[PDB]
Design a protein around this ligand. Structure first.
Ligand code: 6SO
Ligand code: CA
Length: 223
């Protein structure tokens, strides 16, 4: 996250870190046994880390649970990042508490102008590199589909939305991939892609979770 703030330990209790020996992506806990992330985060040998603040120090609220199964959306296109969504099933159910909690799926798509919270352990610099150890937060609005299409001509599908600031300076970034965009207490987005980070007229692009609720629920019911 570029231009964000330190969330505070366990203030984003649905945030997960996907670990393959190191943090490589975020995700969101959607019930005691399932995580949603970006399909571009797919790899084998995922450990889900819940209750994290400092990903390099055991602080006491962590749950580390191996993935038993990953399900990439059947229509994920790695070239266009259309349908950039994946489900991860945990080997055992998380213990839910004030610091480890699921985030509700939306019943409705959020409108442009809606304020959202984006969070992650990604790069904090738009140029060069500095990876924070503790979770970073950004409040950003959802942008109109027209401003999103103008920023990324020919690249925005109906499964994507833009959020952030056209002036630049505040954005999700490398390592934030897969993480949550929460709006009005619902999961609305997944950190998916952009042209760099925090660049003028290049807002972040997010997977539009409200389009996937049917697929998520039916997949969870059967797996
Ligand atoms: N808002 C940008 C979000 C994003 C997701 N994965 C990335 C990889 C590299 C860079 Cl530079 C940026 C990103
Ligand atoms: Ca920790």
């Amino acid at each position: 996250i570029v231009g964000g703030y330190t969330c505070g330990a366990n203030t984003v209790p649905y945030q997960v870190s996907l670990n393959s020996g190191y943090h490589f992506c975020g995700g969101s806990l959607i019930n005691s046994q399932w995580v949603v992330s970006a399909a571009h985060c797919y790899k084998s040998g995922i450990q889900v880390r819940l209750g994290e603040d400092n990903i390099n120090v055991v602080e006491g609220n962590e749950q580390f649970i191996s993935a038993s199964k990953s399900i990439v959306h059947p229509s994920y296109n790695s070239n266009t990042l259309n349908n950039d969504i994946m489900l991860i099933k945990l080997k055992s159910a998380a213990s839910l508490n004030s610091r480890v909690a699921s985030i509700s799926l939306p019943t409705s798509c959020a409108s442009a102008g809606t304020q959202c919270l984006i969070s992650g352990w990604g790069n904090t610099k738009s140029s060069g590199t500095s990876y924070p150890d503790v979770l970073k937060c950004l409040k950003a609005p959802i942008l109109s589909d027209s401003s999103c299409k103008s920023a990324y001509p020919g690249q925005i599908t109906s499964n994507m939305f833009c959020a952030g600031y056209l002036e630049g300076g505040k954005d999700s970034c490398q390592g934030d991939s897969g993480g949550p965009v929460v709006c009005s207490g619902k999961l609305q987005g997944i950190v998916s892609w952009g042209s760099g980070c925090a660049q003028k007229n290049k807002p972040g692009v997010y997977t539009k979770v409200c389009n996937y609720v049917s697929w998520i629920k039916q997949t969870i019911a059967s797996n």
